[PDB]
Design a protein around this ligand. Sequence first.
Ligand SMILES: N[C@@H](CC(=O)O)C(=O)O
Ligand SMILES: N[C@@H](CC(=O)O)C(=O)O
Ligand SMILES: N[C@@H](CC(=O)O)C(=O)O
Ligand code: NA
Ligand code: NA
Ligand code: NA
Ligand code: NA
Ligand code: NA
Ligand code: NA
Lengths: 415, 415, 415
Amino acid sequence: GLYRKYIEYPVLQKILIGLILGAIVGLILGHYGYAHAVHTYVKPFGDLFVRLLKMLVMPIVFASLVVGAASISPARLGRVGVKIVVYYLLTSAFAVTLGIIMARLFNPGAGIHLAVGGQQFQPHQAPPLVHILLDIVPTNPFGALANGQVLPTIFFAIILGIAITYLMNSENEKVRKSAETLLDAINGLAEAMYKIVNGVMQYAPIGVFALIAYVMAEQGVHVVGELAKVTAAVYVGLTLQILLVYFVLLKIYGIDPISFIKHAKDAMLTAFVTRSSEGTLPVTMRVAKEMGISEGIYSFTLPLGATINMDGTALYQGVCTFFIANALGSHLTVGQQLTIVLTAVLASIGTAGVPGAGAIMLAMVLHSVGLPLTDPNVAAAYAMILGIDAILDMGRTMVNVTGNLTGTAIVAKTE
Amino acid sequence: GLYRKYIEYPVLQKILIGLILGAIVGLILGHYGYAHAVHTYVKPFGDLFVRLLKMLVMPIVFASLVVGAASISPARLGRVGVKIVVYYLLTSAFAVTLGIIMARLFNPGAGIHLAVGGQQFQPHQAPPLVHILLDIVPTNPFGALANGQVLPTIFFAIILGIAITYLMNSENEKVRKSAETLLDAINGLAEAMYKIVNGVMQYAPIGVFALIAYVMAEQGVHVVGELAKVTAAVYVGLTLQILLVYFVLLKIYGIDPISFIKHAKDAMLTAFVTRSSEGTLPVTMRVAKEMGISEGIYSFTLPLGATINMDGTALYQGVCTFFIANALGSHLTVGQQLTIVLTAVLASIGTAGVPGAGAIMLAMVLHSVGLPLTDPNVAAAYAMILGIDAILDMGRTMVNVTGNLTGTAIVAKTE
Amino acid sequence: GLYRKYIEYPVLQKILIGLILGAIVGLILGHYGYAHAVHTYVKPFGDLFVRLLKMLVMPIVFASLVVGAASISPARLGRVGVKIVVYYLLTSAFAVTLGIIMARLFNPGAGIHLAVGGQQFQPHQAPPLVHILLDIVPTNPFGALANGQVLPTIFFAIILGIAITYLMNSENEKVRKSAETLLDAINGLAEAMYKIVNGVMQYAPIGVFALIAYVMAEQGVHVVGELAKVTAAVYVGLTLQILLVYFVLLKIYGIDPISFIKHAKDAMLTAFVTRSSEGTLPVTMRVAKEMGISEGIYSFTLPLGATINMDGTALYQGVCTFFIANALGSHLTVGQQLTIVLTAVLASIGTAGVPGAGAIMLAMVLHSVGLPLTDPNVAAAYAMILGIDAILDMGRTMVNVTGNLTGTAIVAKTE
Ligand SMILES: N[C@@H](CC(=O)O)C(=O)O
Ligand SMILES: N[C@@H](CC(=O)O)C(=O)O
Ligand SMILES: N[C@@H](CC(=O)O)C(=O)O
Ligand code: NA
Ligand code: NA
Ligand code: NA
Ligand code: NA
Ligand code: NA
Ligand code: NA
């Protein structure tokens, strides 16, 4: 039947067909002013795909991390954490530098007609760092699970797994049996979640088509002029990030880039369409599992990187800061560029793994170089950037997920 | 001792004694203007009974559905879903038609003195259907469990059970063992919940007495005149719904109606007193379990029907729409009656399984026939209806639960 | 290394060093007006310790209580509950009487210069008792777990454990196996939580230092004059409560007070610094486990007492009521003193196990003797008391936890 024929077709080809055709359809409909129709009837399928992916985030993350922490010694986990944090920081700094270079090679926003009088934006307020750090520890793990909050779930899961391992080495028979039973149940939950991810990827092509079509119909028509040059700068910078950092590092550490891409294509495409690292996390974790990476490594690195490691976001923040600076006519000094590097790395760390968060966090980077959002001209340039936010978000989320996978693979190789 | 004597007495007789005596006491106290006293000291016992029943809804539903979906093939589950949805729609349409017939045989609200100047009601706003459908898929299953949300729990539980079955057929020993352990733990939780339901049914008589007494003391004195004819129409229609639909269908499909009633009496009485299908769900599921129905069928059908299958609600909506129409003096044409049938079926589907929801959803049916709640006269008639809402809600919730059980039994017989 | 040397050092000595040095440092810094600096950089470590302790409350309570109720017959549980409630009420009444005696021996607030014009306080409103009692039964156990709510969790856990035991005695093999698996998994979770408590107690010294330093720097400088006499009355009364009630009862029932103190020192110190019985509950439960007390007793008594049994709170409420009365110049009659005893016992029962709750609940006791917070003078005295609230809260929380442990030990001995 038709359903059997659809299911039997390879998932990669279906996803690619959906992506290309959704792009074409969305562009055509947007030019012809049917973006409202696309939002009304096409978007819900993509929303369903996104919801299905998000449904699996907390269970898979919690269960897989508990099992992995149970299967890995604490010292090794600490070494892995140190290595992955170093990799995260270095890659984010390199991404911001590459974005600045791309902005300087081109000149997005130079000699741009700026129109004042649009919507205003409230100045970015620095949240207290101490509160952010303390929030890593949950006051109620059940509440953290019920309210999302991936990072506190990670903390509690690691602690629980270490405790379970310590119990499984005890002298009491009953304690050992109870710990074994709990661990087996949690592992069963994790495997069930991975199977469900397999199932959802079959519906993935329809959601991919819908999401890309909506994004095109809503924003692609706005990719013209200075905004087109911004988009080109960002996307060339993302491509260079991939080729110069991830490919080179995989070559250095002995990982075949071609096999890596073959394994990671599904996660990359899901990140591209959903624009959510957190939402794409189940697919990324399945990719790591298929790569043969130990659970104790990826179950910890990928959920953490989905929040704190965003190379594409950092590159985009740098490029957009330079664009807004040129639009205002101001020139950024070398010290200001280094301030941009530091602040964009920090903002990328603080950016949530959800659509549109990087554009919001760009305000902190802009403020760091004396470009407050309260200024009417800065507000106008920021509004211009926000118009094509989803277009850039697709690529930058894709690069974020790709970098997370590259780091996980490298760290696994080193262990 | 007294406690032992109370516990040893049959539960059915205790519940019936409580029901009759609470009805008498509440009526007498209401006539004598002691409804405040009943609300203050008698109602809390019924509130406790309701809370105890609601405590078991989410765990029993989730665990039983996971186990049942694990024990049933997906194809069979789909066939069962199709059959049960067909039965739901047909029975709801028949219920609305029967309500219209009862309204036309009598004439509730004909020549009624209508007084304007009471409370006004905001016009019913149609919620977006796409959002309602999307909400079936939870973005966080833990959040869905923690916030009620039976339908998303059903979705996630079915998916999890199917995945667990697929794991239990794998070639890996460890995966099979982990899936077995998880399934066994969930099944233990479900059986514990059923035992707790058994325990709560022992306290049920006191709560039944309290609830019926409060309802009588608060609203029975208002059942006079045109409202008495409305109540008679609704209750005769509900009785006819039972006898003409459920009894006849059980006879057709070979199920003995007498044995069915003997098994289902506890759920029917609990629904009558609590006026909550969702709250009565644990008792209904226990009834189905005692009937010998397979878990894979009832664990799916009953939680779904508790939301989307409400024959009594549909019949009540039709009768009340006709009552409000006569009160306004307007005459409903045949096409308007068919509009009423369709819209009342839709409203019954959308009505929540909680007390008083059907009266709220009646606004959509009224609007469908050009009787907006903004009109002062429509508002007056609606307020008159709301005065005896609980009296009608008892019977209509009872019929809703009875129809859910009848459909589950028929579908089980056909499989 | 330094970390190994720190970890190897005995936990008791580390905690004591931290306590003493934090007290000294906080006092010195507060005199020198650096309380802001202590709040900014020192307090976060104590906040981290408190958060880590609170992270374990719900899982440990739920799992341990389920296991204990499964391991104990319902009749024995009822007998234990009756005994512990009797002990709670008697000890709280004695504590209030002792506080009144201490207030009368000294004269806190006598001849005190009262300044009007400060912040006003809204009159205490008596919450409905029926709603409070009904809230003991949760409408959703998952929601109760996710939102804290220790008491509903206790109720559901006891019910679940009893049901599990009844299942483990069934004739069905599958039901018995499923119940066994569920119980084993829950027990594994409980043991893991206890191990995590062991781990957190290693960091406890730093948090103790930080918390005591902040409390001193913020409020100790205010302990002068009439407030110093209030503090002396409260602390002498707490010491007398310990020695006259807990020590004497332990001697009577054959429990060695010295061994009891050696086992309970960690919980006592944690309660002293955190000022939260609920937050200290994991440490208290670990203390009871190390004492050899059966899980079926302590897993029920300690979580319940952490809410409803607060001797230190009752004593503090009595002392502060007398202080406010003298400050106003009013004289309390014997009947008013007995009203104080009853109302302070009730307020201590209703006081939450969190910092500063007893001061809030003191309003009910004050109102019971015609000292409404709306009066400007009563408001001034209340504000004066609130200035040193944390100083008194430390000791009163310590005494609350000590009394809970004493009652658990006595009840265990009697069984
Ligand atoms: N949407 C991106 C973050 C961003 O907005 O830049 C992500 O989820 O990774
Ligand atoms: N209370 C009914 C719905 C209604 O209000 O009609 C039920 O729970 O089934
Ligand atoms: N903080 C105390 C209660 C109080 O405020 O008196 C406790 O947790 O026990
Ligand atoms: Na990075
Ligand atoms: Na981030
Ligand atoms: Na129906
Ligand atoms: Na409904
Ligand atoms: Na007490
Ligand atoms: Na209390």
